Amino acid sequence: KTLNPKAEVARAQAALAVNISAARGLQDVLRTNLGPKGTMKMLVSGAGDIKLTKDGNVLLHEMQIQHPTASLIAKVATAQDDITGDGTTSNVLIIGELLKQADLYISEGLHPRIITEGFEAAKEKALQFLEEVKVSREMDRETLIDVARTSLRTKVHAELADVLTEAVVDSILAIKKQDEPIDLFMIEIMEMKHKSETDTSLIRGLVLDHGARHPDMKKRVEDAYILTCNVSLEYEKTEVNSGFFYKSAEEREKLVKAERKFIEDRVKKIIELKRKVCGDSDKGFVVINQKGIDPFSLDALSKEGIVALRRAKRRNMERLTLACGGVALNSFDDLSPDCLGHAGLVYEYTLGEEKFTFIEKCNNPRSVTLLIKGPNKHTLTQIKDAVRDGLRAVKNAIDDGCVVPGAGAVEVAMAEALIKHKPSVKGRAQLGVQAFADALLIIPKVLAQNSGFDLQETLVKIQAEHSESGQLVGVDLNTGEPMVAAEVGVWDNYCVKKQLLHSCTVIATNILLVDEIMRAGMSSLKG
Amino acid sequence: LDPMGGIVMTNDGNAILREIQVQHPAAKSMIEISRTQDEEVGDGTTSVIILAGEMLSVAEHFLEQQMHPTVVISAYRKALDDMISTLKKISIPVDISDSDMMLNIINSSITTKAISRWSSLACNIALDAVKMVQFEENGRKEIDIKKYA
Amino acid sequence: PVILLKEGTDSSQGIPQLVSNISACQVIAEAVRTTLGPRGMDKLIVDGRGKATISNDGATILKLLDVVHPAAKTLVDIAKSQDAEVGDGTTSVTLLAAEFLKQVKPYVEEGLHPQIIIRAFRTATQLAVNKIKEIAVTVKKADKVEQRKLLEKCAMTALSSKLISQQKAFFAKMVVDAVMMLDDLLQLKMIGIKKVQG
Amino acid sequence: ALHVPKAPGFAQMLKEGAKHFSGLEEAVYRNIQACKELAQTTRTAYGPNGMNKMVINHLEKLFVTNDAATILRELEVQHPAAKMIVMASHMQEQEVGDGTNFVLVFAGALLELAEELLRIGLSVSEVIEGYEIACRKAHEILPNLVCCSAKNLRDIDEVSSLLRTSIMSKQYGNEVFLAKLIAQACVSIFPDSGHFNVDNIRVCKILGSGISSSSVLHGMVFKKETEGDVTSVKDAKIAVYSCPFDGMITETKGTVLIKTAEELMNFSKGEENLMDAQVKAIADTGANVVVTGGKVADMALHYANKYNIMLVRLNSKWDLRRLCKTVGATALPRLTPPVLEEMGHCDSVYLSEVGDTQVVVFKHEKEDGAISTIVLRGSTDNLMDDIERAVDDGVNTFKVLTRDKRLVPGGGATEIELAKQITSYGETCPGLEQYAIKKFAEAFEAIPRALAENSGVKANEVISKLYAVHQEGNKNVGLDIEAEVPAVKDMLEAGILDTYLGKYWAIKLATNAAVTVLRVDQIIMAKPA
Amino acid sequence: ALHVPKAPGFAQMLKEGAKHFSGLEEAVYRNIQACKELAQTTRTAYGPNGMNKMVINHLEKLFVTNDAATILRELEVQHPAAKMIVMASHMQEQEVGDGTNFVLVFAGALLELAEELLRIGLSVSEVIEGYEIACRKAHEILPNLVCCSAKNLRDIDEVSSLLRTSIMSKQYGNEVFLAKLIAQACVSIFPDSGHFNVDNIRVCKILGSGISSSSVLHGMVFKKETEGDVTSVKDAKIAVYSCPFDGMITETKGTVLIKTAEELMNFSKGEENLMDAQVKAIADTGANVVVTGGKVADMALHYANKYNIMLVRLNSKWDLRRLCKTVGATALPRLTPPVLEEMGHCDSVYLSEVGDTQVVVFKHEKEDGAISTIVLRGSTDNLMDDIERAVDDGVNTFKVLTRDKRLVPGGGATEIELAKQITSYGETCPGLEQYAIKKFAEAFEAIPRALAENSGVKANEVISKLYAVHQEGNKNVGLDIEAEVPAVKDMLEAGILDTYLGKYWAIKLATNAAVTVLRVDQIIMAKPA
Ligand SMILES: Nc1ncnc2c1ncn2[C@@H]1O[C@H](COP(=O)(O)OP(=O)(O)O)[C@@H](O)[C@H]1O
Ligand SMILES: Nc1ncnc2c1ncn2[C@@H]1O[C@H](COP(=O)(O)OP(=O)(O)O)[C@@H](O)[C@H]1O
Ligand SMILES: Nc1ncnc2c1ncn2[C@@H]1O[C@H](COP(=O)(O)OP(=O)(O)O)[C@@H](O)[C@H]1O
Ligand SMILES: [Mg+2]
Ligand SMILES: [Mg+2]
Ligand SMILES: [Mg+2]
Ligand SMILES: [Mg+2]
Ligand SMILES: [Mg+2]
């Protein structure tokens, strides 16, 4: 204040109160999205774009809040989202509950170091319990189906959820190999604004966003070959600056006829290769080019019955090679017939102004394409986000050799273990262990509040049913009665929960140790 | 909070002082000497500032007693020489072939930061980095640059 | 934080403040420097209403100057005191003070104690007063016309560097007869001064 | 005075320019009221008795039409629910093209009923479930109401009797001639094996007399003129050339290099000789008219006029492809004369002038052909635009009927029968969805009420009479328009038919919009930019 | 960038314009720094060798004084930490009248020596307890260092020798004449049985020659004139009348009623006759001068001048009572002849002028009398004000000496002896109060250090020599002044004596102000009006 009069600095109590208020606000705001019985939010940008999503990360990024703690929470949520998959709202909920439980004991007159030590001990105990309670499975087709259904149940209704689950399972089984990790960047997500959303199916092949350009071309071929290349077929100029010099009109015409001979050689080579491969009027030939094609080459290809596609993406070079089985060559050196692909049905579709290209009927494809349909843009975005979340959950369940039951029995078991473990710890860490155990029980409280039942009575009944038994008694969302979680079909993940707990502990340790938010920067008010 | 729009959350003495805009020349000189100390050895950025502040605070008792600053500077230099002599005399050697001693030294040096619970691996990481950074080329020159790690 | 004194308070040290005071007092001496000897002139002061004030006496010039300096107001005070006491040498005291200040300026800038300078000034003033009282040269018994001659000579001497210097021998007898007929308590309010145009 | 502070949390971190609506009073009720106010605007313009609307946009343009799609597109509404309704209407128009105001009225009535359904105490999940059940039931009993079907699709006296019901709803009075013209234009361009294209209908606006002077054309027309001096040719062969009618040059920057007095004198002579040889070789193949798409030259035009060759220049890209597909010829990327396959199959090419507008008419003597052009006449631009929109709507209705030949009675009998069936079926459903089903059944009465209000008679008496007629034993009996008294009339005898697939898609989209709007309870917006 | 909010609790409801300093750094340290900055201002003007100060307030005045009380009064401080010291100095000046700069220096030294204790770890409670214990010890040892008492109080050769030390500290150089004048004025007004009043000394400022031309007057003076022509009066019989010298009328509004011409002709005659009779009856008692206190009349003045009666008019509501108490007369509210016991016997009442200013001198030939008046001569108003302040300080010192005839050795030996005794007593004090005792003992060294800094010698060497002299055996040895070499000199043989009760009260008030400042924790202010 004495050195910089235009600087705002806060002490320890003020900064702690501000952080606690921000955490409580972020917890109360993102609390109606936990569980499938939650509410749907509507976000409108500055340009007038309606977005109907249910993810916690998108809702936190599109909420218009300027705060350092809120920015850190948003960054942590984005990191969790793009590292694991599903676990954004629960992260903020547990962080806020832990901060509230810590402030409840700090305001009475305690030290943050003992609270941090107790939180670390409780996190270690919970990690040990989760590592000793996880059950091993073989992950068959029914397990992945149930996992995808449980992951997609909190997005749409029942029919769309099951359709997306089946589509994701089929795509994963199609892109499944015998070894090596599951490589992504293979399932193309194409959105079409026609028909309804109930007509979502999986296409065993690749769906392009552009079709042919020449009107005198074939539209439906029963049997054709796939040629993947990226050579240039346009009038390319030399690197060094050159110039033509003629004398009369005959020399000019000769130079014009001779300057278009480089692409003519490639056209003749392609024609000869097609005539050697096919021969009669029984098979077709599709040319997939990444660059543009001159109109002369297009007409020359259409004169023989060749459907060529120009201007393609770089990601389609690997998907076509993995699906059909061709060779993505760059030059026309060793043009062998074995470097081609096999097709089954090459037909296009017109949707007003845009054009599509569907490649179906394949032998053994390895990169499928999910077709998404929606009447609106927000619905398409929500379906795409749900499909991405389901794919991430399936990948996380496949990469791990264990399964964790959902509902809230794991949190109750962790709280019981922490309650049974606090008397074994010395010092003042018992209060921290109790706070960590009470903060972990916020998932069933929110799950029971959004359904329409009580909270304290439900928690008491769950604890009474779990203490007298030895099974994972979950929390039901239909009648409120305590039921089994690892018996109906509710599942979750292990690494995702571990990363969530680690991030929560790191955030709690970073917040409980910061008590000075000094701002001594340049205002930049010159001119 | 930097004027760019980020968040600077750390505990080092130089990372916090470099994000504070001041106008007094004394504060600028303090920031400069702190940055030079951080760029020289790397550690000990707050102790030097605290010692300089204490030495300048205990110097105002003599300035109000019609004392000339030349004698004060002479006494300061004579005390600095004696402190350097004492520090060189109380020097205790140590062997560089013992890995446990180096690990304990690194752990005692990093016991203040937030890695007090993970120094069991950071110490070995730093030891391996130091062992791999040291390289001997041609001649009797043994450089230890930090642009390769 | 909260300030100590009022925001807008001017402060100074010692040596620079004294130097500035001496430099400001040296300028006041230049205003009453030409009006002194018989060959000297007078000044003309104009107020904010448009009235000319022509006066050869330094007291009126210092009063019509309206000085706002805190150190330059000491000359006006001693000038008014001298005018109220005897009413004669109003500029000589200012010239002597300015000369003393200019003489002690190097002694002050060199590094001398002000108490020693004050003691030296007091001793010199006492010695000068004693010497003047010693060489006063007064009489005890004179003639009747000798007193009138001395009064006329004093009047002609006092009216030498004035505007009526060409007629100093005519007003001497007039003021002598006016003062001689002023009872015994010397009532200055009993003398009427009339001004008729023409 | 005491100033109340803000809530320490989301209220303080809400930032300026942003809003928040957490309660149902400032969100769901607000959206319902906004949708009701939006539907009340286009409610008077629904049936054939609906008036027009003069909408002026920001570009200082006039839009005096009757279709609700253009009106909704020319409103610029800054409301989320209204924007979703407009998007649903646009999707319905793109899918079918004949059901926007009906969907708007249905959604408005459904939201107005859901308002009181939530006010009395019912929740949103039960209401959504009941609405979905009622929609599924209506879609199940929908195919069980088909009473007519299209026999032939190439008959002039049969197609004109189907689209007349849809045309009369837009143009009341003069609709028989328009229906006959649309039927003739669709028959003249109808090929075989189905597959009807929508881009094979051209509209030409020529200012002249009225609607009685309109006529169809079995070809194409262009608003250009003849470059050469050739007037009209009888048996001419069209030779399309995509390249400009000029001498080809190099794509790379290059200049000529002449020498002494030999090349400087022979260059122009050789160029003229080559141009003359090319012009002679072009006309020696039997061609009479050359249609280009680029810039022409003076020497080439003179050489073409010397050998009597008609030159037609146009710059529209798609027009060249349309003219090629109409005559059967293709395009050429180089100045190459055709032999026998790339010739022209025209009939008569002449240049006329009607209404102080010189146009080139490409009349074809064949009754079939490829594409056609409907020359429209009128005195105002708004009337011409309305006639063009009505023709487009009729073409869309014909395409829908070709896609599905299932006809259902229109007017106001199908909706009443569906509502009665839903009310009779909903009485045997327990739980809390029975109220939602009964409300969904009551939402179908917003169409007969609006029709009776637009006709100029009472609505309750008409609804009661229709219900009594349906309960007596009749099904194909709806309301009357020409009758000044509130009575009923048979729909099968008059000839009131509508598309079944279009109405099904409209009901599906309306239900989707309803269940999408009735699912958001809080809106989070920011500041406009 | 990112902006931080406020504390949701007390900072939000703090209201703009106000301030809050709850921490010890932004409150206690700030007050300590403010007190140190205040003490560093009036530190060079403490001893006799200190310079003066010219302060100008907002009234465009001139105040060139030397006492710290006038400087603190003409400063307008906007800080409570310095306002407390200003109030303490004002209270000390009102109580004693010679201990403001000493109190300020003591408080500043105590705060400076307690700041380091609070920084190293000594709390406020232990520091306050140690300071109170040290103050009690100093107050207990203080009566043990007297060894000097005043004999007679009416001797002119003894009173001037005691106040010379206090006069020299304020007016260095010309002090013997001022001391003699103050002693003569106190002797001429000294009554019996004690009871010395401070309002019995009147100061008169007359712009004349130098300082040596001043003298004392046994009586009173007034800067007025004579209403009548009577000037030189030998045996004057003063008859003071509190009522105005005019015809008395009625308090209630009442007019005169006349009808016939006899009353109109005789009213003025009877009024003049009654006025002449009253004037003759007043002067028949032997009064030579009438001093009124209101408005005079023309007829009354003429009748008084006819019978040779001097008239003195003055209005001040205090000078009349002072003259009545001096001449020993009572005021009469009516125009009645006084009695013999209500007459004012004087000695010589004349009207003269000194320094071009007419004044009425009431000189009395009696050695005793009542009150006196000191006439000041000078050429500057600031010098006259300084002389008047020095005379007032000398009168206050004489009053203090009359109240308590106990003397203590001045200069700087008493403080050194007290500090040595406190250090010797605090050595056997266990606990944590020994540090506070040693710090309180170190605060007594601020007076000799300031004296050496004002004189122009080394303070450390002077302090060391004084400590060595005190440890040798001598106790009444201070610091020499008339020597450029830092040496020592005896205070009892020279005559540097100051009051004891005044110093005791000063130390008590300084300790009270110190503990009051130390007791302040947090600071809560508002907004200026
Ligand atoms: N069908 C279900 N039965 C029981 N519990 C469920 C069901 N669906 C979701 N949950 C619970 O709701 C919680 C929130 O899940 P969700 O919002 O989909 O992702 P996240 O766990 O990242 O918030 C999960 O912890 C899960 O245990
Ligand atoms: N000739 C007619 N007889 C009876 N009803 C008609 C007739 N023409 C149109 N209608 C009714 O008017 C309503 C409005 O139809 P229209 O304006 O063509 O499309 P939209 O239903 O999208 O407004 C239709 O539901 C139809 O039942
Ligand atoms: N002749 C002298 N020699 C040495 N010190 C003196 C002499 N006269 C006065 N002092 C010092 O001056 C101090 C008082 O000065 P002054 O400011 O006039 O009164 P106050 O006691 O109110 O501060 C005393 O403490 C005394 O020690
Ligand atoms: Mg989820
Ligand atoms: Mg360190
Ligand atoms: Mg003169
Ligand atoms: Mg319609
Ligand atoms: Mg004093």
Coordinates of C-alpha atoms in Angstrom, one line a residue, chain C residues 1-6 70 77-78 81 84-85 113-115 119 122, chain E residues 48-49 51 54 76-79 172-174 208-209 356 379-380 455:
Chain C
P1 CA -1.9 5.9 5.3
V2 CA -3.0 9.0 7.4
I3 CA -0.8 12.0 6.9
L4 CA 0.7 13.9 9.9
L5 CA 0.2 17.6 9.0
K6 CA -2.2 19.2 6.6
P70 CA 7.5 36.6 5.6
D77 CA 8.2 47.0 10.7
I78 CA 11.5 48.8 11.6
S81 CA 8.9 52.2 14.1
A84 CA 6.7 56.8 14.5
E85 CA 9.7 57.5 16.8
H113 CA 27.1 29.7 14.8
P114 CA 24.2 32.2 14.6
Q115 CA 24.5 32.9 18.4
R119 CA 26.4 38.5 20.2
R122 CA 24.8 43.3 20.0
Chain E
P48 CA 18.9 27.8 25.1
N49 CA 21.1 27.3 22.0
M51 CA 16.9 28.5 17.1
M54 CA 8.4 31.3 12.1
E76 CA -3.4 22.0 13.0
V77 CA -2.4 18.4 13.1
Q78 CA -4.7 15.8 11.5
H79 CA -3.4 12.8 13.4
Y172 CA 19.5 34.2 25.4
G173 CA 21.6 37.3 25.7
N174 CA 19.4 39.9 27.4
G208 CA 9.4 52.7 20.7
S209 CA 13.2 52.4 20.8
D356 CA 3.7 58.7 19.1
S379 CA 10.4 47.9 16.8
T380 CA 8.8 44.6 15.8
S455 CA 25.1 23.4 21.2

